[PDB]
Amino acid sequence: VPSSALSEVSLRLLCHDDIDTVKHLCGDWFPIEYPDSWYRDITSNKKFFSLAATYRGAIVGMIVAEIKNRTKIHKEDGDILASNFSVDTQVAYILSLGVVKEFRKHGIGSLLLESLKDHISTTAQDHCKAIYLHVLTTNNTAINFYENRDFKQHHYLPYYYSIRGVLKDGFTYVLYINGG
Amino acid sequence: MKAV
Numbered sequence: 001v002p003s004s005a006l007s008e009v010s011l012r013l014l015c016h017d018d019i020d021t022v023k024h025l026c027g028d029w030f031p032i033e034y035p036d037s038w039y040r041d042i043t044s045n046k047k048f049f050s051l052a053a054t055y056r057g058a059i060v061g062m063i064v065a066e067i068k069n070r071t072k073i074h075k076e077d078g079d080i081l082a083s084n085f086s087v088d089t090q091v092a093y094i095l096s097l098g099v100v101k102e103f104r105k106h107g108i109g110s111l112l113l114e115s116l117k118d119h120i121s122t123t124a125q126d127h128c129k130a131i132y133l134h135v136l137t138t139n140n141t142a143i144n145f146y147e148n149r150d151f152k153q154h155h156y157l158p159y160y161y162s163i164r165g166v167l168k169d170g171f172t173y174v175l176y177i178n179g180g
Numbered sequence: 181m182k183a184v
């Protein structure tokens with residue numbers, strides 16, 4: 001892909017009509033079988049920030065996140081706000097982040113992440129205090145991306161993922177924002 | 181990448 005590609009990249013929210021494209025792209029990006037009800041949810045439910053990067057019409061990347069109250073964090077990560085005592089504290093969970101292979105290393109993943117931060121700053125500037133995500137422990141490309149962007153490793157999650165019939169370990173990564 |  002041309003090194004001027006980032007300049008031609010646009011952004012838009014996912015919609016219902018994107019389901020088939022999103023399912024196909026996810027099939028390539030993530031070795032995980034998400035059900036059709038999930039694709040329906042992330043393309044329609046306004047509780048999600050589901051953002052696509054597009055190039056000459058077509059989706060070449062996406063980030064899907066949910067801003068939610070601290071009480072909605074699952075037990076395995078219940079301690080990411082252990083030093084924060086405010087009941088109004090929110091967090092943003094990144095459910096999915098991916099970029100088409102040929103378009104990687106052009107800044108699109110960075111743009112998607114930055115756009116989530118901008119959305120948080122615009123929509124939940126006071127209360128959202130962290131961004132967190134899960135990643136396969138073997139996913140060095142993603143781990144380097146996050147660690148170079150101030151995310152810190154927080155939990156080791158043994159056999160967290162089911163990957164084509166076999167269990168695999170995960171990490172939780174966390175970035176504190178607006179003071180934590 | 182959320183788990184299922």
Ligand SMILES: *[C@H](O)CS/C=C/NC(=O)CCNC(=O)[C@H](O)C(C)(C)COP(=O)(O)OP(=O)(O)OCc1oc(-n2cnc3c(N)ncnc32)c(O)c1OP(=O)(O)O
Nearest residue numbers: 096097098099104105106107108109110135144145148181
């Ligand atoms: C749950 O979904 C969270 S965990 C799963 C993450 N997603 C995947 O594993 C799917 C497959 N992997 C990907 O889609 C991408 O590798 C991700 C999304 C991880 C990164 O996307 P992208 O490659 O678009 O990110 P980036 O902004 O371009 O940064 C990587 C990177 O590139 C360079 N780099 C080299 N040359 C350039 C130029 N000219 N311009 C910008 N960037 C360039 C870096 O220095 C990068 O960052 P680094 O810090 O080295 O990792």
